[PDB]
Design a protein around this nucleic acid. Structure first.
Lengths: 141, 149, 82, 129
RNA sequence: ACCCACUCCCGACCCGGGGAGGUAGUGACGAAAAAUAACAAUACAGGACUCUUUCGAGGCCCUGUAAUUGGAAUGAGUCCACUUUAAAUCCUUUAACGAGGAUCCAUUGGAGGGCAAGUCUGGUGCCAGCAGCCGCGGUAAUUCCAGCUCCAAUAGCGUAUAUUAAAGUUGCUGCAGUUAAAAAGCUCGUAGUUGGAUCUCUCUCGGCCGAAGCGUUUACUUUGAAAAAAUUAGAGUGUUCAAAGCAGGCCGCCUGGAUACCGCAGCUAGGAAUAAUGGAAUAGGACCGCGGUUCUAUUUUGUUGGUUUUCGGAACUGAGGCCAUGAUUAAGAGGGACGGCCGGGGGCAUUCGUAUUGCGCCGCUAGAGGUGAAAUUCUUGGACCGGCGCAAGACGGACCAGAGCGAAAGCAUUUGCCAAGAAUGUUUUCAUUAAUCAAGAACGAAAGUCGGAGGUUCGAAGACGAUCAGAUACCGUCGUAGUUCCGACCAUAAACGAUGCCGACCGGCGAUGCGGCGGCGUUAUUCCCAUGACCCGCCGGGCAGCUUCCGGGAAACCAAAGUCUUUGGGUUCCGGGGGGAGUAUGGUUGCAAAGCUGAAACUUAAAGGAAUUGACGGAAGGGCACCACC
């Protein structure tokens, strides 16, 4: 059992503090290795330059080509792969243009049948992909 | 349970409820005191004195006849031993085990039992130093402890 | 089962128990006055004696220590006290 | 070794009452045990008890009337102020209609309602309901 | 951008200055209020607390695509004049214009489940895509792309990320640790944590009537001081309501601008349970009067002087009176002594037993090993077998058990010596000395390392022979290190009861091991008692077993793995989805092998536990049919 003494506060507090490091989420948040490894570096979004269009194969139970883009982030020169969500939206992206990319929704984890992809394109050339998809706006010329 | 064994024995003395002197016992308190003095002069520890008085002279409990315990009587008369008899016997047992281990170096069981004995010695000596029964500088060293025996 | 109760007698259930586990603990031993046929005086001996006691006027072995209750010699008449 | 003789006494009373026994033996007895038992009995939760006096440490034979659901000890004896009493009652008691928290205060050993009447706090010994 | 008009500040100053500050601008950070319609008349529909007749009669209350009809209402907007203000703007106020498809048009996400709301239609056809998760899509897709319809919030709604609750998935409240992740191999041990019972009228007085403590300390609890505002809580107050604000109210007067909380530490005063702590044990102990010493702020209205020969204070000691003189009990806590036993517990020495291998001699003889068959191997230099001896090195059968001992690892021929130990017995002794344990330490199977001795057997490696598609393996014949002992190292095991230790409580039964107690009777000591072996019980530890709706648990199952949401006896170690991985790296230990400590990036929706039903089994046991056999 655990100690129950009026003078065990140091023991209890210290044991809790040592045992909190075996919490995966607590350790990931407080160790600093995950923040260093994060390409966004703690940001919610990041602007990058599209290097090439890459087609990502959906995982084995499904079958599709997930149209992604490799982008290089302006802030730190890191190369990530970002999903271009809707259909025909890869046609809205050219090569060597600026795109705003956000997380994919799992806080750094891959989503669905898209291996190794944890980012999605939000804007292209300072125009949202939703506006171009719905026809509300057109990419600049 | 035992301090140094997995034993959970229950065997011990069971004092009777009555604290009075037995009706059969005709020795005066001073008579028991002189018998205690004689037995101490013979060279006996208070436990041995109590055992002899119980077995032969019918003194069921010295504390109930004389109103005092055997060690207190020995101290008050001035013939109590230098160090308490439990610690003395623990040191004697340690000395015996060390003498055996000197000529039997492959006896790991003897070494383990010596460790237990010296731990008991140290605990008792610390308790006695707390009660000012032993001088605060007293220490059990296994180099000339046979002289203490 | 309804402890310390006079309605159901239990001398027999109390002296059967362990001496320490009784309602009020009490020894299972006793002191006994011993006459030796060759002697002429009382000797009060503990039942569970650990000493080879001798007659106070002679050199006769009154009793010998055993694992429990001491073993008395033949002919010595022993009677418990109290 | 045994600490907290009151914990042993309360656990024994609880175990005996859960088996439906009419009496329970408690050893060793102590002043705190006797006061806690008196508090329990004044509220009709145990009944009469007898203190067997042996010359070392007494025993208690407690007559059980099956009105007791749980008698428990709170270790350590946390200091309780009059403000913390409501939170302790919410934590320990099964209802605001019945059940008692026993405290040792400078005014004696008493339930929580009596401690509120005398406007005193103290240290929590245990509870019963 | 405008201004010192407000709030305040500065200067020699009523006067000047202030990008402090105020005002406006941009502003879906965010917060409050709040439009996008309301109503009536006919036609339906619904019910009636209407006739009643479920045919029907029905402007009683209602509902709708009427995209029917009709008027009433209003502010978004435009604009005028005030008002606002330093000047303006914005609100507020007034007038004019301002609504019918009131086109003066509400959006953002969804419609398989979680989760509210379409297996409607068209397209696509594992593509395109959706999908937080499960999943959808491979020719009716309830899920993609659309149309329609529906629903959720609504001037807002979706997405990413940080964080809180959910998470009793960090557990103080309040989690787990036999098998799901997990208790150190095992003991000792300092700190830490936790600790059995017990003790119920004293200083100057003009109110027994102002006061002192000079005596024994704290924790706790209650109280009283002191403690910025703003924020939070909270009293009052119709901002048109509300967020707010600190205002305001009445016919010049009345009134507010409260109050609470403010943890810990510090200060203060009552209480005295609980918890710690203290005195008297060589009495250099309490009270009491005596023997002895001092300028002792006066013990000289007189010029002090040597007439302060002295109450009051700091000593050292003696004789006394006096304490009811002063030691709680003796834990079903612990240590120690003592008694008779007990055990494959340990060390040293000693002895015996066959077996195996080898050697010598004798006899007979051509085979003997070995195998699922063989072959490799030995063999007329006489093998195998039988007999008599000798030697060596191992090991200690049967007895031998759900029996014993040990901290665990582990421990079995006889005898002796050496020290140790549990339990029991105890009207012995000490008297809290205890429990658990960071640091530290002892021991720790097997294998392994170094040195020495030995080397029977078995035998990693290796050689050969087989089996096989292949075998590098299983099987066979040999065989090195090793296996044995001595001295150093290593410190790991499915080191397991996969189950920490200490304490209490909660069923039954029969056994068994040790000790003790009691008792018909049977045997041996060839005689009295005793002592053994039995028999029948009881008590205490111990290894276990059976049983049981104690209770628990996911169950298996467990009298503990119970006394757990009715949750708190004490304490140590330790787990937090599966992998990466007990890996990398650093430190440390080791001669080495390696041991201890021990990540992260990344990857993933399960991995796992227990039990159930099937299927299968180169698992066992049955049954049947001349499509089985005899």
């Amino acid at each position: 059992g655990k100690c129950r003494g009026l003078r065990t506060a140091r023991k209890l507090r210290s044991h809790r503090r040592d045992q909190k490091w075996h919490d995966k989420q607590y350790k990931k948040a407080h160790l600093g290795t995950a923040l260093k490894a994060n390409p966004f570096g703690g940001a919610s979004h990041a602007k990058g330059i599209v290097l090439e269009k890459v087609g990502v194969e959906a995982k084995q139970p499904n079958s599709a080509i997930r149209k992604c883009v490799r982008v290089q982030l302006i802030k730190n020169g890191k190369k990530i792969t970002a999903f271009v969500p809707n259909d025909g939206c890869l046609n809205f992206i050219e090569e060597n243009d600026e795109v705003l990319v956000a997380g994919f929704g799992r806080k750094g984890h891959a989503v669905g049948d898209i291996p190794g992809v944890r980012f999605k394109v939000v804007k292209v050339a300072n125009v949202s992909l939703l506006a171009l998809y719905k026809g509300k706006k057109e990419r600049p010329r | 349970g035992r301090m140094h064994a997995p034993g959970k024995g229950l065997s011990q003395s069971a004092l009777p409820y009555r604290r009075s002197v037995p009706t059969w016992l005709k020795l005066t308190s001073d008579d028991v005191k002189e018998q205690i003095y004689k037995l101490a002069k013979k060279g006996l520890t208070p436990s041995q004195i109590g055992v002899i008085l119980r077995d032969s002279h019918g003194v069921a409990q010295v504390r109930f006849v004389t109103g005092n315990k055997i060690l207190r009587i020995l101290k008050s008369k001035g013939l109590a031993p230098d160090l308490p008899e439990d610690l003395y016997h623990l040191i004697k047992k340690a000395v015996a085990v060390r003498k055996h281990l000197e000529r039997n170096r492959k006896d790991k069981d003897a070494k383990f039992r010596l460790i237990l004995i010296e731990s008991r010695i140290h605990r008792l000596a610390r308790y006695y130093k707390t009660k000012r029964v032993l001088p605060p500088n007293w220490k059990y060293e296994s180099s000339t402890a046979s002289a203490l025996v | 089962p309804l402890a310390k109760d006079l309605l159901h007698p239990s001398p027999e259930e109390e002296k059967r128990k362990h001496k320490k586990k009784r309602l009020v603990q009490s020894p299972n031993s006793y002191f006994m006055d011993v006459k030796c046929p060759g002697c002429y005086k009382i000797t009060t001996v503990f039942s569970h004696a650990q000493t080879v006691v001798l007659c106070v006027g002679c050199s006769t072995v009154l009793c010998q220590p055993t694992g429990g209750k001491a073993r008395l010699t033949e002919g010595c008449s022993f009677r418990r006290k109290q | 070794v045994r600490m907290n003789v009151l914990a042993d006494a309360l656990k024994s009373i609880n175990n005996a009452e859960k088996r439906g026994k009419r009496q329970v033996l408690i050893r060793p007895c102590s002043k705190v045990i006797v006061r806690f038992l008196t508090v329990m009995m004044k509220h009709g939760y145990i009944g009469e008890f007898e203190i067997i006096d042996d010359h070392r440490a007494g025993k208690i034979v407690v007559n059980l009337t099956g009105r007791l659901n749980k008698c428990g000890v709170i270790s350590p004896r946390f200091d309780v102020q009059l403000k913390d009493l409501e939170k302790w009652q919410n934590n320990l008691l099964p209802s605001r209609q019945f059940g008692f928290i026993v405290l040792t205060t400078s005014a004696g050993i008493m339930d929580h309602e009596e401690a509120r009447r005398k406007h005193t706090g103290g240290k929590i010994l245990g509870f019963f309901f």
